[model samples]
Target: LSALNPELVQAVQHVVIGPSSLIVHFNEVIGRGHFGCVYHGTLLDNDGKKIHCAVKSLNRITDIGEVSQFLTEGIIMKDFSHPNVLSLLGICLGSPLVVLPYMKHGDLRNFIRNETHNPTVKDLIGFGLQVAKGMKYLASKKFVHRDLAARNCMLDEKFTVKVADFGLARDMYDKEYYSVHPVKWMALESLQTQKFTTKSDVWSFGVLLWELMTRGAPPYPDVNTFDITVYLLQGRRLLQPEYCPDPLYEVMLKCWHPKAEMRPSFSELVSRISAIFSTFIG
Candidate 1:
């Protein structure tokens, strides 16, 4: 992280990185993925208060490209302002850490599975609506969350949803594309050509809907990532979860349309979800 580009974080005033020594304690390991491991830690503030935060550190960061990507994630989250988006507290200069507010309930994937009772469509739709609203905000800002999924969202103390991972997010500053994974959650066109847009995110959200309906079952659990492209090319999608209502599943299907142009915009999805819930019976 010593070689991280200065230009990437220079203008960002809010997301500050204290020295590595400030990390007084590591509470636990919250998440681990290809990017790195996220740790629940305590930061010793100037005033002596223990500020609990989630520190995401890059694992096996070998090249400049990886460092640049890590900085990009911080830059992306630092500039965004939305209640449903993750809050970027700061970065840790000595280490590859992007500090975020610690959420007790953890990611939505684990939260759903931990539920004592099976969630109804209404309950699932509620979480989906919040995610859609967050994506709508990102869309409004002209950014594309290339990797949106249940595991990418977090739940607060009140279970309010907030989109958390920004490692694969990029501004639609008119450019399109990248090598993001989560094969089963990706759209068909993106899988084939590596092209992406907000529409591609719409496709991932469809898979996310399946996650919600199943209360966090892996998308296409039976299939391997390498085979996902062929599976999608065969015009196959995830089987509708039994708990998902027909109307909701129909919406998910629209998002998976092979033609990105056919997928509804995030704002449109938000409205569609609202309409679904207004008529949804408890």
Candidate 2:
């Protein structure tokens, strides 16, 4: 018995495959994740204009289930049209590739760490507010970004931030603990009960806020990766980064509340950060 009806299948198929001819170039590999490698590419529009884009191909998989799941990501992204969320430009059918607008500045983590790109405190707050807006949109749609972190967020040429990689981590590695575990960003309850919700995502947002304030420093730097769970269980949280305003750090604390219900929603976070951002300008 098929779970998808004929009409549903047709709709999904339409969304999952775009004209493969649109991809004009895919010469350089720009990134690699569990899903596989992403290539810097060019797309040809109907008017023959070249557009820069990224082409993501799945890791070689013969299984139909995994292939279907990969395509499902394409379908889901095709419907997203927010400024703060990455938009799906198209899908390449035969090679199982997804096309996205090229983000030259790369992920937030690396961008913040680059010495040449010194972001002011106000600029950092602006980035945080943009991420909050993106997350707020996801929360409104009942979407839980289980892996929200600075590494998973991308920045465009103008430094506009976009939330990315919704569950694309997919159990890749444990070799580089902080780089892959995702445990550092897990909320107290999520670490304990293995439950994930939008609130848990909010908790990850707090760590991301810390990352921005510290110019991309890793969380729990002094603690062993294996001990993070116990450390959180003992009520230890990430210390405030030096030079971070007390009020902004207070917002991060609210996100770390043990009780998920007590944590402020992404909507509230957007408003709170927006208010904080206004002060810097005024």
Candidate 3:
């Protein structure tokens, strides 16, 4: 831990350091990623209040670099306070845990996939608007979300969407050998040159919109993941989902423009999606 002292000191100033004794780790694992597993836990706040939270425990930190990367997410989350953005609750260093509010509904992907949920067109558009708003905030802060997909967007009990898993996604790509990249969700430029800008994120957002329209179906189901770059280079795009409005589908097309600069910004997306979503409301 000595090598990590400098990074920890910087992180301490922005994030709360919670006592490990106050946090109760349950047996349930809510999420798994390259870093480690996310456990459903409860944090005893001041005055003995039980706050249900998710503990992102770093069980496999092999070096100081990895530790710094883990801390970077907590630090980034500390300054964010938006309804659509997941905020950091606190950090517990005893076992290297980052505490966050437990999202009961889990990720947007599974939530839409559940037949019991039965979301209407309006609800689906609303989810898109929420994500666009969240990305708008991140873009305003000059923070580019390299990974923006339904799987990384969490839903709360009220069905509110919050964008999450910032550093974790980038960490996955850093490894030489990993499960697989989010190739389908990536923009053409990102696939070719590994460049990620807000515009590149917009392209992914379009894929997410397609996911919402399809009720969580994977994008480009007929095409191979490895061939996506060549397929996209040929100007091929995701076909409109059944029942998706022409205007909404057009928005998705704009986001997938060949040139990164031609893609709509998240700010523009919020307005476009907002206008489209309003038509569905009774």
Candidate 4:
């Protein structure tokens, strides 16, 4: 890491090396990731003994192309401190080095892909509530995570939903093209014209729910990523499996409709799903 960006070491201190990532003296790494890596470390109390904490190493600029996104993620996490939303510990604040608490159990993708992590319908609904709650908080703030895929969502050992990956997060009201991952998880309107809104996030959320139901099955399988672009150009819906539930199918159908305005807002969608979840549990 130091060789990648030597300037990073000067701004930071006590940067120790670890098994997965460069373990600093500050904390721990409980999880590993696509960007960098994670460690479960400790913090200090009044007596300054080690308390439980997670240390996540931020990626180098070359890896993700926008180190500024790291800063943006930091800014956003700092602003909103919700229980459902993963909180930021402190940053290494180095030129090339950064660290966050490693969330245990890792991201939601692993859980969905492995049936052991996704056992039953009740379990699905239970996890869905946590995801929805976090999105609800984001919706309340008028923030939209343009990319809300399974790999981006996470759980701790205790099963708390942690919303990570702000590299694609943007202001819903920004009114620019602000988007990426256009092939796999984008909504209809998103594939065309590069537009965004709270409603578009609903489309993303529905896909996320679909991902949870199918155990992280690839969205629109058998089709190539860029072909999704051709699909929108051909006027086909972003496809899913035939066995998807009726009400849930309806939810996604409503989300990725042709007219973005007609789509439900995240807040409204949560209210809708919460009722359904209540019924299933009842």
Better of 1 and 3 by TM-score: 3
Top candidate (lDDT): 3
Give the RMSD in angstroms, all C-alphas superposed, for model 4.
8.1
Q: Tens digit of lDDT per residue, candidate 3, span 102-124?
A: 88898899899999989998899
Task: Show model 1 residue runs off by greater than 4 Å.
Answer: 1-10, 17-23, 31-36, 43-51, 58-76, 115-118, 168-181
Kindly provide the TM-score of model 3 when superposed on the true structure, using C-alpha atoms. Answer: 0.86
lDDT of candidate 1 over 101-162, digit per residue (tens): 77877778878888574667788899999999999998898888888989888888777898
Better of 1 and 4 by lDDT: 1
Q: Each model's TM-score, in the order given?
A: 0.78, 0.87, 0.86, 0.73
- The predicted structure with the larger lDDT, 1 or 3, is 3
Query: For each candidate, how many residue pairs have backbone atoms clashing (under 3 Å)?
Result: 0, 0, 0, 13
lDDT of 4 by residue, 1-282 (tens): 423344433322233222233334434324322333444555553465554555544433554335544545554455666766765554544343434444667778787677565356656766766777888888889877777777777777687887776532221112223395244677777777687677777778878888777767877777887677777667676455454557766777787776778887767777777776776643
Q: What is the lDDT of residue 142 in candidate 4?
A: 85
Q: In candidate 1, which residue pairs clash?
A: none
Higher-scoring candidate on lDDT, 3 or 4: 3
| Number of backbone clashes in candidate 4 | 13
lDDT at residue 186 of model 3 (Cα atoms)? 92
